[PDB]
């Protein structure tokens, strides 16, 4: 997250870290046994880490649970990033409280103009590298689809939205991929892609979760 603030320990209780020896992508807890992330984050050998704040220190609220199954969207296209969504089932159910909670899936798609909260452990620099150990937050609006398409001609599909600032300086970034964009207390987006980070006229591009709710629900009921 570039240009964001330090969220505060377990203020974002649905936020997970995906670990394979090291944090590689975020994700969101949607019930006590399922996580939704970016299909471009898929690996073998995931451990999900819940209740995290500092990812390098054991501070007391963590639950570390291995994935039993990962399901990438049927139509994910890794050259265009279209359908950049994946479901991860945990080997055991999480224990849910105030500091480890699930986020609701949306009933409606959120509109341009709505202010959202994006969070992760990604890089905090638009030039060079510096990865934080504690969870970073950013508040950012959803952009209009015209503005989005004019930023990324030929690249945006129906299953994407942009959010952020065309002026640059505040964005999500590498490492923040798969993590949540929550608007009015519902999961609206997934950190998907961008051109660099926090650059001028290159906002972040986010998977549009409200187009997948049927697919999530069906999948969860059958697996
Ligand atoms: C991602 O975090 C890659 C990524 C995602 C989003 C942005 C953006 N500028 N909003 C840049 C890069 C990963 O796969 O690690
Ligand atoms: Ca920790």
Curated annotation (Swiss-Prot):
Protein name: Serine protease 1
Tissue-level expression: Synthesized in the acinar cells of the pancreas.
Activity regulation behaviour: Is inhibited by scorpion cyclotide trypsin inhibitor TopI1.
Catalytic site: 40 (charge relay system), 84 (charge relay system), 177 (charge relay system)
Gene Ontology cellular component annotations, sorted alphabetically: extracellular space; serine protease inhibitor complex
Record-listed substrate binding positions: 171-172, 174-175, 177
Assembly with partners or alone: Interacts with SERPINA1.
GO terms under biological process: digestion; proteolysis
Keywords for this protein: Calcium, Digestion, Disulfide bond, Hydrolase, Metal-binding, Protease, Secreted, Serine protease, Signal, Zymogen
SUPFAM superfamilies (UniProt xref): Trypsin-like serine proteases
Domain Peptidase S1 residues, every copy: 1-221
Catalytic activities: Preferential cleavage: Arg-|-Xaa, Lys-|-Xaa
Major localization listed first in the record, in broad terms: secreted
UniProt subcellular location: Secreted, Extracellular space
Residues holding Ca(2+): 52, 54, 57, 62
A Pfam family annotated for this UniProt entry: Trypsin
Family: Belongs to the peptidase S1 family.
Keyword Signal: yes
Cofactor(s), names only, from the UniProt record: Ca(2+)
One MF annotation (Gene Ontology) recorded for this entry: serine-type endopeptidase activity
Disulfide bonds: 7-137, 25-41, 109-210, 116-183, 148-162, 173-197
């Amino acid at each position: 997250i570039v240009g964001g603030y330090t969220c505060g320990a377990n203020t974002v209780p649905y936020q997970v870290s995906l670990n394979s020896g090291y944090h590689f992508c975020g994700g969101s807890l949607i019930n006590s046994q399922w996580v939704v992330s970016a299909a471009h984050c898929y690996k073998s050998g995931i451990q999900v880490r819940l209740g995290e704040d500092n990812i390098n220190v054991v501070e007391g609220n963590e639950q570390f649970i291995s994935a039993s199954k990962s399901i990438v969207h049927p139509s994910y296209n890794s050259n265009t990033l279209n359908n950049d969504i994946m479901l991860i089932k945990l080997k055991s159910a999480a224990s849910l409280n105030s500091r480890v909670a699930s986020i609701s899936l949306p009933t409606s798609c959120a509109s341009a103009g709505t202010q959202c909260l994006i969070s992760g452990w990604g890089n905090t620099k638009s030039s060079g590298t510096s990865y934080p150990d504690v969870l970073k937050c950013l508040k950012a609006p959803i952009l209009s689809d015209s503005s989005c398409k004019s930023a990324y001609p030929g690249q945006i599909t129906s299953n994407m939205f942009c959010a952020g600032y065309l002026e640059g300086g505040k964005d999500s970034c590498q490492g923040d991929s798969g993590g949540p964009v929550v608007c009015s207390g519902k999961l609206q987006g997934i950190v998907s892609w961008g051109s660099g980070c926090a650059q001028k006229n290159k906002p972040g591009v986010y998977t549009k979760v409200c187009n997948y709710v049927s697919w999530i629900k069906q999948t969860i009921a059958s697996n």
